[PDB]
Structure 1
Amino acid sequence: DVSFRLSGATSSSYGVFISNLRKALPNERKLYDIPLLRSSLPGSQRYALIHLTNYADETISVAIDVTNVYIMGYRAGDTSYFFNEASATEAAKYVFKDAMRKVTLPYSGNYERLQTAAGKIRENIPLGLPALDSAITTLFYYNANSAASALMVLIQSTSEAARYKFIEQQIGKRVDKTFLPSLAIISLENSWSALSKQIQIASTNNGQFESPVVLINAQNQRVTITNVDAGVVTSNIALLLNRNNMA
Structure 2
Amino acid sequence: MDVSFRLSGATSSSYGVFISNLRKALPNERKLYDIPLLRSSLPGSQRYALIHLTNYADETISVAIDVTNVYIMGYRAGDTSYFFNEASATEAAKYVFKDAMRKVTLPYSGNYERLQTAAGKIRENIPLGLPALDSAITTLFYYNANSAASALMVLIQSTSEAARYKFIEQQIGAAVDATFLPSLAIISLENSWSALSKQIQIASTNNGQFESPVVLINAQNQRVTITNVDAGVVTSNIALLLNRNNM
Tell me the distance in 1 between the aligned counterparts of 2:118 and 2:41. 31
- Describe the superposition over 1:163-221 as per-residue Cα deviations: whole angstroms up to 9, x where unpaired: 00000000000000000000000000000000000000000100000000000011110
Structure 1 residue ranges, 4+ long, deviating more than 6 angstroms after superposition: none
TM-score (norm 1): 0.99
Q: Aligned with 2:138: secondary structure? A: helix
Q: What's the Cα RMSD here?
A: 0.4
- Describe the superposition over 1:135-167 as per-residue Cα deviations: whole angstroms up to 9, x where unpaired: 000000102111000000000000000000000
- Describe the superposition over 1:31-84 as per-residue Cα deviations: whole angstroms up to 9, x where unpaired: 000000000100110000010000000000000000000000000000000001
Tell me the distance in 1 between the aligned counterparts of 2:173 and 2:31. 26
Tell me the distance in 1 between the aligned counterparts of 2:220 and 2:238. 19
**Where does residue 198 of structure 2 map in the other structure?**
197
Tell me the distance in 2 between the aligned counterparts of 1:72 and 1:134. 20
Q: Aligned with 1:109: secondary structure? A: coil
**Where does residue 111 of structure 1 map in the other structure?**
112
> How far did 1:87 drift?
1.0
Q: Does 1:134 align with 2:139?
A: no
Give 1:1-247 correspondences, 5 Å limit: 1-246=2-247
Tell me the distance in 1 between the aligned counterparts of 2:154 and 2:138. 12
Structure 1: 5+ residue stretches without partners: none
Structure 2: 5+ residue stretches without partners: none
> How far did 1:16 drift?
0.1
Tell me the distance in 1 between the aligned counterparts of 2:111 and 2:232. 27
TM-score (norm 2): 0.99
Tell me the distance in 1 between the aligned counterparts of 2:36 and 2:79. 35
